[PDB]
Amino acid sequence: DLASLAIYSFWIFLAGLIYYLQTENMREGYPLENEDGTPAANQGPFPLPKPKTFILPHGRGTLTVPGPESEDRPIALARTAVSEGFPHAPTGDPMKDGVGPASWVARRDLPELDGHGHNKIKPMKAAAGFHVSAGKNPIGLPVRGCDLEIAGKVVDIWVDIPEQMARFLEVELKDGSTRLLPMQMVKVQSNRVHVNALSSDLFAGIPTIKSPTEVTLLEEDKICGYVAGGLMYAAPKRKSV
């Protein structure tokens, strides 16, 4: 019977398809490692796929996954148990060390470029013809930490040109330097921008950008990570409200 041939074939295909799908999703973070970083014993029934190579634009090489996996950065943690499966305690300051919710990946130290080879993200002062077009403009607003203290003042929005959206607020600090706060972790309010992740005193600590009119992917990860970790690691100084 043709319905029976059809249905039975289909389950075969769905099996093959799931197989395919699952191996395609092992292109990163595999093979599995024990907590010491060595190759784990049981990997699983699905093999690593045959590798594929992406040609990056703008002369930026290729990326060829799966491949030799490495953090390319040292990890300040230490076991807390004598066996698998327990948390790993920061050996210093998790925020300054970039661990836990302060974690950052070691992405390239160049800026994401757009489809015409131009920095995707620029301070709005440098992005010709960009302006705030609706909503409250935060440039000038003071910035407040979860300790209810003033950390700085907003001095520019950093915009995504091709996507025409706000990605960071550049915030000037007590000492004149600036920091990028991810826009997703701020609350623009009538009369201030409130950042809840960090307390005022941890703002200096935000990773800085080597060049004042661009952010590299690496620096983005460092800043985004630093800011997120605050939620966890600044909760002592986080006053209720």
């Binding site: 997703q184 972790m185 990860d221 990570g225």
Partner: protein, 302 residues
């Protein structure tokens, strides 16, 4: 609350974005349209420009010829009165030829011909739009996944309106153009074929439709959740994994025990969707051609 990033807090605007050229014939692109601050809270404020070559003209014109073949019928059915047209809009229906005319085009405008005309016009509209989905990919140097994905939808549509009625001997077996009539068609189809809940393909189709809601809820939630780390920038995350890809993967790994990569989620995405209409299409094509009653079939096939 923290920002949830469902709507934006500040909108910025800059010069109108005319797009990448690659190989696209710019003679056939339009100018930018207005910008909508309202759309801006959720997505992009920019409307236009739109590529509109010879195939687009064919598709839209043919597309309208469809919507006015039906319309004319509806106004007519209303006795030309706009009060009635508006009142009874959902009850009007352009119905296919009787079973007596089989696959012939020999049937009177008032009792089938107008249905065939509208079907002709729709068939030209969709297929032409299909070529568009390919060519626009092509002109930009991109993959053809969209065209291939679209073909899955086209399949179910083709089965319902063209392949199945052809294999059954009569245009009468096709769906009518009408809001309520097509819901009645759908219901009575299931009744006539033994309750389509007994059709395994219908079953799968439901699993994927729901699963599509499950997946996109998961996925969309996940990107929004890691958007403080640049998550939505999925292509550069594909070329250079960031803490956003890693936190997303690990959320899921720690929740359900396994997980996607940032390109890989999109293969689960494309397939979960595409398999809705793929399976469903098979389900219907078999209905009444190979299997008259799915309850009965069920009894004899597990």
């Amino acid at each position: 609350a923290e920002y949830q990033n469902i709507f934006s807090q500040v909108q910025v605007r800059g010069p109108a974005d005319l797009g990448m050229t690659e190989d696209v014939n710019l003679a056939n692109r339009s100018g930018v349209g207005p910008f909508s601050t309202l759309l801006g809270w959720f997505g992009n404020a920019q409307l236009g420009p739109i590529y509109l070559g010879s195939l687009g003209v064919l598709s839209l014109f043919s597309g309208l010829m469809w919507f006015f073949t039906i319309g004319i019928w509806f106004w007519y059915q209303a006795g030309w009165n706009p009060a009635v047209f508006l009142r009874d809009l959902f009850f009007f229906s352009l119905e296919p030829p009787a079973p007596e005319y089989g696959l012939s085009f020999a049937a009177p405008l008032k009792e089938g011909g107008l249905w065939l005309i509208a079907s002709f016009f729709m068939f030209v509209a969709v297929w032409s739009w299909w070529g568009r989905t390919y060519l626009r990919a092509q002109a930009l140097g991109m993959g053809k996944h969209t065209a291939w994905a679209f073909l899955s939808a086209i399949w179910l549509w083709m089965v319902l309106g063209f392949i199945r009625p052809i294999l059954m001997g009569s245009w009468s077996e096709a769906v009518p153009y009408g809001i309520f009539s097509h819901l009645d068609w759908t219901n009575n189809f299931s009744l006539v074929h033994g309750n389509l809940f007994y059709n395994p393909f219908h079953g799968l189709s439901i699993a994927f439709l729901y699963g599509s809601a499950l997946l996109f809820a998961m996925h969309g939630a996940t990107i929004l959740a890691v958007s403080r780390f640049g998550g939505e920038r999925e292509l550069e995350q594909i070329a250079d994994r960031g803490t956003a890809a890693e936190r997303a993967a690990l959320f899921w790994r720690w929740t359900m025990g396994f997980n996607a990569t940032m390109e890989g989620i999109h293969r689960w995405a494309i397939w979960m969707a595409v398999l809705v209409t793929l399976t469903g299409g098979i389900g219907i094509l078999l209905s009444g051609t190979v299997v008259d009653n799915w309850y009965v079939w069920g009894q004899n096939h597990g």
